[PDB]
RNA sequence: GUGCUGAAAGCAUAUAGGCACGAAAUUUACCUUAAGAUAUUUCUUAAAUAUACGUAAGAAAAUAUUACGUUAAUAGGCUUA
RNA sequence: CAGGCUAAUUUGCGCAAGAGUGUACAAAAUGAGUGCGCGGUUUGGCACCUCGGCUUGACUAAUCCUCAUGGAUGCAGAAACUAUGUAGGGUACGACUGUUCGUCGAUUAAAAAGUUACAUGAGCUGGGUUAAAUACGUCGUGAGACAGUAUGGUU
RNA sequence: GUAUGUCAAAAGGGAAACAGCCCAGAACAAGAGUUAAGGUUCCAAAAUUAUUAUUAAGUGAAAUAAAGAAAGUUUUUAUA
């Protein structure tokens, strides 16, 4: 993969851990393939994984830098993981140091955002809540994940921060899933840019 | 989506995929377009 | 029709195998037969008109080792195992371009 | 007729063997090189090697009219080895003479009500001679789903090492050895 | 197969082998499953053994008439409590009336004997949830067991019709009665298709036979009425069986369970009215070994002309 | 099976594999420890007197 | 049918891998019947127990099922409402 | 008559290709003459082999309603069209006809189909077909006959 | 109609079951006997026997459904 041999530049304050091969025992498989833990640590946070074993990690501290390789390059399987595994990486290296962000814009007539707190549904102490008001009998309230934070610079507009970006992205279609955008007249939520051409009428 | 036996591509966006294969079932063979979606298509039956 | 002879289109390798050795075993008779008759420098004419258009075991190809010329068919090919008393009669060669 | 003149006490005695599922096996594997890819038997492959105990085709008094099978405990059947998609693909059918009451379930559906010794005994039971002896031999059929089980005092032993523990060879060796000192 | 998919023997014993803790999948099947899949519908509290007394009509002091079933409760005992660890489920066994010592076995004669408690007439389970649910045994259930307003379940037996034809049994329409039919006008026609159906009667084909005198379940009853004294608990509506046998209220599985305040208010009055029970009940659990070891020994005749 | 002949094939059981190595061009003589219980008659080499001559090593190790 | 992440294939992709939404069908739940492990600080050394007989019945073609038999309201009669 | 073989045909379907229609624009809808097939409902071939209604079901899914859903210059909404999942339940009442079928009235969320000996007469019915009687028309020299018609006729 | 065979009047082995197909013509027994067709993980006598490749669909494995579609995969031949 051209994504897999380009090396990784960590910036300043961004730790990378690399563990030894392990193997959790499961009882209902004979042979569970080793893994390694990676743990990419940084000012906003921390995130791991477990990579498979056939990809190998030259973590050059003095250079500031992690190339990804693996032992066969003709297994198909080792290809594909070799560019998943590096794509990751770079969400992560990027995610703790600098945060990934998704905007949301709600348009129609009506349609609003607030962040408040629930006590009554919280999942963890201290949740917010995103309430949206969409044109429908009820209100729609949806509980941000531990680790995220929301906020409404405008009441037409919301903004989610965090340090996973799967997470992010995975919560902003948990919202935009109440009101996709229509061809007709363009209501709906908006997710980083997306737009929608128009209709004739 | 329309159901076809001879699933093509009419524009140069449409695209080949197949779908909905898991540890069950094989899927089938899809036509997506960003363009027109007038030109998803789906190769093969339930 | 609704009475079942079940035949199936193609031979399984042990029927194969066996088919190999038959016409091996043709080919054995045949030169055993030649050969004893070079001794004598003598001939028959249906031992020079078998060496002459007939192949060898080793000189055929599996096409025609395991199947026949059928005008009936697809493709014009048939299984040998189709031909009555295939065990026991000899067919190797089939017309040119089939 | 002197090859059958004797004590026949030990021959037709029941043999307790165990067997793991998650062990691996160069002999019932497909795959044999390189040592470290050797599986474990196949379902398949496991349960005809057993149905051949249960039977008792491995003694060489074997008799189809007696019953002269041996017990076989399994362990580990909750990592049952399959090939491909057996585990989400096939299909275990059942009817009771009444239209419309026919019960279909895949493997792991059944391996999630009644776990992966189901499926091992009705692999098993498949096997074997379909015969008033059938239900006898498939009751011999020890399987478990994880390490523990009720026979570890009942699997046979030779020296206090019981048959596929690390030193079970060297026991059954040095008795042999001591068993050539008579005329 | 015997019953359902499993092969296995009737008098294995594996269960105790196969266990969670050792790294195993939870199995969909056993009684741990079973519970955790009724969970919701479980009731909290224990019900009621009651007597069918008869029908009526609830008049309201503004216009209300709502009919309405009456049901007493005739001394009715906790007798056993049936835990997971001894039993593989929550339930509490009430009793209900009483019976002549010389009609009661032996068997269950001492069986009452190690719990202080006098012969009853009818035993039933009601399962609960959990250990919460569990009382102490040898307490009366009152009708202020339950609150007017709750809605409850009344299982009972139905009254018995005897052998029945297909129209009183299954509804069948019956064929004509006077255009030409001959000797058929409740009859059940025709009983399957011809060859290409089988050429046999398909199991489940419904043909007359007896009906009636089994169980019946009715849900979602609210109580009207509820008198100590008189020890009756009036629900709406009908309920199984005829006058004078016994049916079983408890609260109703498809509705929350009632307020915790007052699943804590009954508990608390049970102690009130019987703060000895657990008292009473060792000494009678004590005796039941003297007079057990004298059975044994011989000398039960001993013990009976002390005093 | 219908016959008795046939009957006797299908419960036919092979001899021991020691036996099928059969020897060429000499007779042979090989050591065929069976997996049996002896009798009683094996008297053991502690079980005979100082003079019987037949005392002598394993037959392992006269091999 | 609709997605998030995301490579093989620098892009793209809800295709591999990792997650998710989603139906009067399915499963569970609910109800009945069957099943009969199990439980009781239960009973029994020639019994415990069950049956027969008699009065019956929440039962009822036979059978079966559930009670009672004088220390008894099982049926009938009588008395009162 | 039914079953079996076959599948020309069918009031049974699918796929491929795309003349053309769609103000524009092939594939929203529509689809000439065709090709490659499935299926076993209709009318037939062969000769292995000498009706309808009522009652009570079971099964199929190529779906009339109800549930989820893609497409729709031709999806504003509503309603409908097309298509993908899906057979749990429902699909009624009456007049005419011996009728299945068909026509019609009036409601309905809808008033859809098929297999099972065109399910079911040792479960019922006997109106149709339907032997003896009889008449009409037609045919026959006539006795009689008719894929005709009419009344009646041991289930 | 013609040519050849079997059945008819032919048992036995193979084709799951089988008048007509593939072997082979039953006078009666014995044999780990020698073979035919056909097979050799278990039912079930005999290989979980060796070599090189393909398939990932339980495709298939003893009765080939078609035209056709398609960044499924492999090989070869051209080519950047
Ligand atoms: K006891
Ligand atoms: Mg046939
Ligand atoms: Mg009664
Ligand atoms: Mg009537
Ligand atoms: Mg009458
Ligand atoms: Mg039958
Ligand atoms: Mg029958
Ligand atoms: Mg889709
Ligand atoms: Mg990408
Ligand atoms: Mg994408
Ligand atoms: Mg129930
Ligand atoms: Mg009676
Ligand atoms: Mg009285
Ligand atoms: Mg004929
Ligand atoms: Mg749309
Ligand atoms: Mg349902
Ligand atoms: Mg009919
Ligand atoms: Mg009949
Ligand atoms: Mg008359
Ligand atoms: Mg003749
Ligand atoms: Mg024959
Ligand atoms: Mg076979
Ligand atoms: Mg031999
Ligand atoms: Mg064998
Ligand atoms: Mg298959
Ligand atoms: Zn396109």
Known sequence: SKLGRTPLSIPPGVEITIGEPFVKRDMTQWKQQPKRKITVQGPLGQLEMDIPDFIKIDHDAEARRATLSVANRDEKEQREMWGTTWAYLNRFIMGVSEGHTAVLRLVGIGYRATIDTRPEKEEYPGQQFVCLKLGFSHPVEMGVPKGMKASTPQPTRILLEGINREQVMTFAADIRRWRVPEPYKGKGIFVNGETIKLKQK | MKVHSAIKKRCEHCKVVRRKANKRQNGYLYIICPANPRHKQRQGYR | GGLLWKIPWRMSKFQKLRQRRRLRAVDNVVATIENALAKKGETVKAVERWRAEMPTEAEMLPKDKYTIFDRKEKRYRKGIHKLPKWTRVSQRVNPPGY | ?183 | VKYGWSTLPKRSRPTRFNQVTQGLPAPTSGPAAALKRREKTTPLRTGVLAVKKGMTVFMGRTGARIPCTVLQLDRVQVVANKTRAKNGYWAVQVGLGERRAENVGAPQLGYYEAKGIPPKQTLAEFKVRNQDGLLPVGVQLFPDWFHVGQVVDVRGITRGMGFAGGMKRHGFAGQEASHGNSLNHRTIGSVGGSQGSGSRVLPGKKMPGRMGAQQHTVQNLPILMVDNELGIVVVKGAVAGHKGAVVKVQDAVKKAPPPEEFVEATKQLLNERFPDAEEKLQAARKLHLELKEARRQGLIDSLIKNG | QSTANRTKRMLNIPPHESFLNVPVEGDRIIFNPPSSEASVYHTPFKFLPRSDPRRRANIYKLF
């Open chain 4, 1 to 183: 007729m002197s090859q059958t003149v004797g004590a026949t006490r030990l021959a037709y005695s029941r043999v307790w063997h165990h067997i793991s599922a998650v062990t691996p096996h160069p002999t019932l594997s497909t795959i044999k090189a390189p040592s470290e890819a050797i599986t474990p038997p196949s379902l398949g492959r496991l349960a005809s090697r057993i149905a051949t105990i249960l039977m008792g085709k491995h003694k060489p008094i074997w008799d189809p009219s007696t019953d002269c099978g041996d017990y076989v405990v399994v362990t580990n059947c909750a990592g049952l080895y399959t090939t491909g998609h057996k585990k989400w693909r096939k299909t275990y059918y059942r009817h009771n003479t009444r239209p419309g009451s026919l019960q279909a379930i895949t493997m792991d559906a059944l391996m999630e009500k009644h776990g992966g010794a189901e499926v091992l005994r009705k692999a098993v039971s498949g096997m074997l001679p379909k015969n008033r002896l059938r239900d006898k031999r498939l009751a011999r059929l020890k399987a478990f789903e994880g390490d523990a089980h009720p026979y570890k005092e009942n699997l046979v032993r030779f020296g206090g090492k019981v048959v596929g523990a690390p030193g079970w060879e060297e026991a059954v060796k040095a008795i042999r050895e001591a068993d050539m000192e008579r005329l």
